[PDB]
Design a protein around this nucleic acid. Structure first.
Lengths: 207, 157, 259, 74, 196
RNA sequence: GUAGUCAUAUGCUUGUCUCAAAGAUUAAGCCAUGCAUGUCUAAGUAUAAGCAAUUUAUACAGUGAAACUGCGAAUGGCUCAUUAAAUCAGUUAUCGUUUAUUUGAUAGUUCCUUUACUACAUGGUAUAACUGUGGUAAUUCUAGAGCUAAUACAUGCUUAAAAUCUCGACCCUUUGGAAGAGAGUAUUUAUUAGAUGAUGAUUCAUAAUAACUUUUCGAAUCGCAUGGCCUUGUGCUGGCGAUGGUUCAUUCAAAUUUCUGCCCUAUCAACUUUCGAUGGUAGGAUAGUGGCCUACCAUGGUUUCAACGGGUAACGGGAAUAAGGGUUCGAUUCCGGAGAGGGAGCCUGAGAAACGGCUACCA
């Protein structure tokens, strides 16, 4: 009965505070649920594991214990595909969560560019594989291929950081979902303000 | 680089625009969360063109204000964006048919927008519990001068 | 507390039921329905102590359980010892084709008004909330916990509708604004009926309202307690105890024993 | 209709006109059968039940019914 | 060690008392439901194969497949367990039960006859039980009489079974069961009604 | 002084009439003896006379045995023992939280396999109950044999083609004809709505939106009402309810929650910070708010209006008349927290800090 009643505290004026009530059941406090990653099945066969907990109202709440694949969205483009997350880096909350590759709502991680690479290719005619072969278009320029241009000319100035990411195969993104609460793990792809920044934490972190 | 990192590990907004804004390369991109609690309250000029990321603000967040609204003098400036206001009222005494003085202390949250100072009258609103004590946010600040002891100062404001 | 209450005490059951103090110890507890606990009249009360058609407790048990169906509430059959018949309702006693209004006194006691097959058709509904829901559609809701689909758009949240039960059709509504007639569903002033004077909103969380009536008395109550009994002076239903207006203990005496 | 009167009036008002009859002491035994039954498996329970002081409602009816047919007049 | 030996196939319930020690010595240190070679009973059991059906201690304590321990252990039982009855979900109880491993402490061991041998036991082969309950679900009925799916109800109605008996009252009645699952017009009416 | 004591004091003991009080008061001394929350049909399960009691529905009458059910059995009721604590009072909506109960409402986009969709003349199971075979100092015991249900498991194409959604030309006037216009949700994020509901209020909705979710959704109901429709078997006709589901608010709630108020005490001065004393923050729990914690740091701030703090066994406190007066009430606490050997863990669930569910441990 790990409770959370604010009784076992000390009122403003730090004087101990009285109790007449045994711990009451609605102050429930469930066992924490650290969330790891299977981006290393060196031991861990069963890729992802999610256990459902019977919550109050009568509903179920799925709890993420072990995972390997989540869903992520590229802010800029409005694209979202399910991908395989790689390694967790910098958890902010604490560095131990990174050491155990645990999944916090706001844990910054890596993903496979594959789905985004695949897409950025189909909609712009730009693979993002090593720079030289850059574009891959059609043979004749009379029909609908005229659009991959129109979009491509949209000065798709995807930050020098977004570019490097793709080619390296790794992609930076933060999460936005309580695994211990919904069982999933969804995140947005890192960019501008935070990208530049979180990276800094990483550059200086190792150096 | 300052308002963003400054120790803490990140500071976005409720309306996650940012980096995506680079998509609307012509109009105004520098959006920040804008609001208006209303209830006959003006929204601070400073609140709008600020870089501050205070989730516990009543103009920069999905923090509501409901019912109880307060006016009280300020005691301390210490604490991170939190202040203690002291209210001074009289209590009646059934028997002797007279009053005595009394003071309740209140934990108030202060969005960066308005600038504090010790010993000034402040107006708090009733916002959801933000912490053990906090349950009030500042909405309107009036600067005032008290030459010395804030404790000595007792006004049926 | 253990869980959720489930009974009710003689002593604790509302003065609106004009109940028997010596009676027993309990009292039929209203069933979760269209009207709130305090603002309601469970059938058992309605027939036993009210109409007096029933009597002993088992008397009811027959009436509402008998395969004949003797009780109707707003054009529907009811067989629950304590269905909470609320304000502005229409109850029909099958076996006699009796039609009643569930309305409060002027002294705040639940009164049964006899209606003609005519009014028994229309029932007055007050508007709870108003917002648009699923697939671009407008919904209105009445105190009577009625949920309305595609309602006339000229209807503000604090409105009052006239309902044709027979066709489950609306007709002639009327919001609350300076210059209407109203009934107060609850308060130190319930059972009164007058002309709305003006509605001062204070937003801080509680708006108020004023009123006048027959002897031109000044009335004060919170909006939530105003029910628009009609638009511009003409009331829409026959009121109990003559007109919705109470007398000084002094006026009662002079009217009755003429002092 | 005495045929209505017979359906509505209380079982106690009927024994009073000497139409329904007796009111034997149920309490004690019923409380004692609860005793046994609460401690058995269906097998015997059924049997026991075939011994709980009479006066079924099904019984009350047949007796009510008999007053029905056998009576006519005024 | 007394034996409650049951024979599936026919429904033969027999009880054997085996006093001498030497015979039973084969059941020692064997698990629940193992394959018994009942030749350590040269008597009436010449070439037989049993399954150790269950256990009972000198104190009425049954066995619990799984709890592999030659002795009694005490556990908390939840629904879904044996030697445990319900009555209000979570009737969790500290009930004590006898292990899965067979021991000399065992008083009664039940057995299930898999393959009988040349030998012949009276209580077992002498039986011919007239199991009383014939199919009752529409589908189970036809499954016994043939009748492919397409087969109309009325067919199954008159294709059911009936039972006659004489009552302790010297009475002669005829009884028969309802067939929940029978596709009637009513069921059909309702479905159209619903989609209407 | 006085006697009386209208002092008792208890100390002596007698027709007809009743609004009618009596181990909380000691210890919050517990279970002698007596004792004990289960249950019903329009309604879900009963034998073609082995529940079977008739009696002759008759292919499933009642009729019930028993079971299955499915329900409540988190209700109280006694218990301050605590508790100087918001306990509690007001005094908070809860943009911060959960919600049976009750209604109201209510749900076309599930294929589209590249319709032997099989074909829904609505699936599969599984089981009891049940007959039996038993065991044992002996169980709410239980064994092994068989049974059968089913409103329970477990399902499950929704065709009859080109499903059904969603433009609409167009006339063709209505029957509209409409061409050919185009095509569901619990669970996720991620954007966009939202200019064109709402708030002071919104990143609000309820929108979408994709994705992508071991994830849903979705009446293999029963009940009478089967006589109208055409067909003539037909197709219906389902009527109407029972029996569901759906989400919303529908009371149900709680659950917070401001905003006034316990005894004294300054001979309380000071207090509170190792993780919380504060802020603020990352997460995580939490069902879901919260230092509640993980961190991570802010130093906080409380306070003579005595704060830290101390001391008051403290469980604890609604009606109305009323020139004046007359009077009186709710009824031995309206109110309202903490115990049901010790401890532990666990239990139900809409819904328990489950007393009177466990366990297991102790006793």
């Amino acid at each position: 009965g790990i409770s959370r009643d604010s009784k076992h505290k000390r009122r403003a004026t730090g004087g101990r505070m009285p109790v007449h009530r045994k711990k009451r059941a609605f102050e429930k406090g469930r066992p924490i649920s650290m969330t790891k990653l299977t981006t290393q099945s060196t031991t861990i066969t069963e890729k992802r594991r999610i256990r459902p907990v019977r919550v109050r109202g009568g509903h179920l709440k799925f709890r993420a214990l072990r995972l390997c694949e989540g869903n992520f969205s590229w802010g800029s483009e409005n694209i979202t595909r399910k991908t395989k997350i790689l390694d967790v880096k910098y958890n902010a909350t604490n560095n131990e969560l990174v050491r155990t590759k645990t999944l916090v709502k706001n844990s910054i991680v890596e993903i496979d560019s594959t789905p985004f690479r695949e897409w950025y290719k189909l909609h712009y005619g730009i693979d993002l594989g090593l720079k030289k072969d850059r574009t891959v278009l059609g043979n004749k320029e009379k029909s609908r291929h005229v659009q991959k241009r129109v979009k491509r000319t949209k000065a798709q100035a995807l930050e020098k950081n977004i570019e490097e990411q793709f080619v390296s195969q790794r992609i930076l993104a933060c999460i936005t979902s309580r695994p211990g609460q919904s069982g999933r793990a969804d995140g947005y792809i890192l960019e501008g303000k935070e990208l530049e920044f979180y990276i800094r934490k990483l550059q200086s972190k190792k150096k | 680089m300052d308002t963003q990192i400054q120790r803490a590990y990140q500071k976005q907004d409720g309306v996650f625009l940012n980096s995506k804004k680079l998509l609307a390369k012509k109009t105004s991109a520098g959006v920040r969360y804008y609001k208006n609690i209303g209830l006959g309250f003006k929204t601070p000029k400073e609140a709008i063109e600020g870089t501050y990321v205070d989730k516990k603000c009543p103009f920069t967040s999905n923090l509501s204000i409901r019912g109880k609204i307060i006016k009280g003098l300020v005691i301390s400036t210490k604490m991170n964006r939190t202040v203690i206001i002291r209210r001074d009222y009289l209590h009646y005494v059934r028997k002797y048919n007279r009053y005595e003085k009394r003071h309740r202390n209140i934990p108030v949250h202060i969005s960066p927008c308005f600038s504090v100072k010790e010993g000034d009258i402040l107006v708090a609103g009733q916002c959801r519990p933000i912490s053990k004590t906090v349950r009030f946010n500042a909405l309107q600040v009036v600067p005032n001068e008290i030459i010395g002891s804030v404790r000595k100062q007792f006004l049926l404001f | 507390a253990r869980g959720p209450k489930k009974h009710l005490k003689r002593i604790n059951a509302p003065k609106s039921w004009m109940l028997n103090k010596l009676g027993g110890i309990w009292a039929t507890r209203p069933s979760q329905g269209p009207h709130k606990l305090r603002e309601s009249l469970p059938l058992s009360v309605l027939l036993k102590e009210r109409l007096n058609y029933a009597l002993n407790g088992r008397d009811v048990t027959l009436i509402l359980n008998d395969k004949e169906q003797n009780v109707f509430v707003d054009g529907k059959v009811r067989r629950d010892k304590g269905y909470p018949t609320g304000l502005m309702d229409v109850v029909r006693i099958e076996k006699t084709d009796q039609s009643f209004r569930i309305l409060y006194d002027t002294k705040g006691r639940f009164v049964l008004k006899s209606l003609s097959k005519e009014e028994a058709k229309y029932k007055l509904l007050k508007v709870t909330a108003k917002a648009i829901g699923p697939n671009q559609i407008p919904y209105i809701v009445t105190h009577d916990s009625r949920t309305i689909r595609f309602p006339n758009p000229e209807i503000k949240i604090g409105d009052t509708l006239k309902y044709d039960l027979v066709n489950n059709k609306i007709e002639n509504f009327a919001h609350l604004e300076s210059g209407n007639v109203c009934y107060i569903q609850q308060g130190n002033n319930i059972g009164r009926v007058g002309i709305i004077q003006h509605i001062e909103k204070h937003q801080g969380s509680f708006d108020i309202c004023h009123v006048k009536d027959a002897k031109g008395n000044a009335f004060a109550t919170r909006l939530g307690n105003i029910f628009v009994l009609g638009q511009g002076k003409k009331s829409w239903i026959e009121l109990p105890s003559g007109d919705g207006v109470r007398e000084t203990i002094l006026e009662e005496r002079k009217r009755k024993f003429s002092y | 209709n005495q045929q209505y009167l017979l359906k509505y009036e209380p079982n106690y008002r009927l024994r009073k006109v000497k139409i329904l009859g007796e009111k034997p002491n149920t309490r004690r035994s019923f409380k004692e059968l609860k005793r046994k039954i609460k401690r058995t498996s269906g097998k015997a329970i059924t049997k026991l039940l075939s011994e709980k002081k009479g006066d079924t409602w099904a019984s009350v009816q047949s007796k009510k019914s008999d007053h029905l047919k056998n009576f006519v007049a005024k | 060690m007394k034996f409650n030996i049951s024979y599936p196939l026919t429904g033969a319930q027999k009880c054997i008392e085996i006093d001498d020690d030497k015979k039973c010595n084969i059941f020692m240190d064997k698990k629940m439901g193992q394959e018994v070679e009942g030749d350590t009973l040269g008597d009436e059991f010449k070439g037989y194969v049993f399954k150790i059906a269950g256990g009972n201690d000198k104190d009425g304590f049954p066995m619990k497949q799984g709890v592999m321990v030659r002795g009694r252990v005490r556990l908390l039982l939840s629904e879904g367990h044996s030697c445990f009855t319900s009555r209000r979900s979570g009737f969790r109880k500290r009930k004590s039960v006898r292990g899965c491993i067979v021991g000399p402490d065992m008083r009664v061991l039940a057995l299930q006859i898999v393959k009988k041998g040349v030998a012949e036991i009276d209580g077992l082969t002498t039986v011919t039980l007239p199991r009383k309950l014939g199919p009752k679900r529409a589908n189970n009925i036809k499954k016994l009489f043939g009748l492919k799916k397409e087969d109309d109800p009325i067919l199954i109605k008159k294709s059911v079974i009936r039972r006659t008996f004489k009552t302790a009252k010297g009475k002669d009645r005829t009884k028969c069961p309802k067939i929940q699952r029978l596709i009637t017009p009513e069921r059909i009416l309702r479905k159209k009604v619903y989609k209407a």
